[PDB]
Amino acid sequence: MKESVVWTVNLDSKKSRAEGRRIPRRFAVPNVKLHELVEASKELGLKFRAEEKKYPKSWWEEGGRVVVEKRGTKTKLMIELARKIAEIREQKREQKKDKKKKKK
Template structure:
């Protein structure tokens, strides 16, 4: 099974209404596709970056997305990826 991860899901600058899926404390500032992909790779999820995609709520903005193999609940995936991005930044 696949899961789609939009950068907005992990972005601490976005509101829940704009698409953030995890708490502000768990989220990271402006996550990049490459960071999400690297974190997903560390978790063994075979990430595939799709640059030319736009998050439906902000269709005018080509943010891109990462498609991963889903091996746990989506919220857990988002939290683990966010934590890996935080640790790689510090």
């Protein structure tokens, strides 16, 4: 019931510590996915929130930032957030807009 701030890059493995990595490689999702970050919170209706830079009218950006209600814990929240986000990434694996696209 508190507030936590997480960026899209932290949960991304492709982003090294210099890029901003706070998630363990074991559950890290390479390449941030809006479908995974937002769709994850939708599953619980209230766990984190996606924020966007003060001025979206710009180029060369990391996309957006996400905040999780929890606070107190650090990477574990990322592990939990990745736990929900990892499923959605996995959802893209189970179906690839092709296996289901053609039904026959």
